[PDB]
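Replying to the earlier thread about multi-chain prediction with a worked example.

Input:
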Amino acid sequence: GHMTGVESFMTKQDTTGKIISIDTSSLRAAGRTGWEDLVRKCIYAFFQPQGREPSYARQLFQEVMTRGTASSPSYRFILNDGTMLSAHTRCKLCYPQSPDMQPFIMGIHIIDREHSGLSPQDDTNSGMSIPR
Amino acid sequence: GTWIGEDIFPPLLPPTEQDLTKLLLEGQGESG
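Result:
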């Protein structure tokens, strides 16, 4: 919790409830590869149907559309590396005032790692041809 | 009036997998 972190991303949906784009600039600051894998996995679960009930995304949609703001619970998922991590999502309705465009839904996804899993492995590159 | 009110579709259908990889790459133009 708190305002301490960085591993996260946001989504942009048009007036059609469709995804127009995604903002993962934050993940880029994490310096940890696989962001795409974590982003897809988290999004897959968020939009995943809860058994006989509708997906979480739907619940937050009607809530953010009727209230203007919604947030889903913390879900857990396994990455390609078998890593088990949980994350949450929140929908926020936004309507353009200056520009003559339509309102869009901003979906923020926060990553939450149960156990500590960020060892000093900042050493993926080094060479390339013939450095100094 | 309000769009999202019913413009976001009550069904809410997620993507497939080609839309996420495309929006995740970003670039607008595609060098090449």
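Chain A touches chain B through 26 residues (CB under 8 Å).

Feel free to reuse this layout for your own posts.
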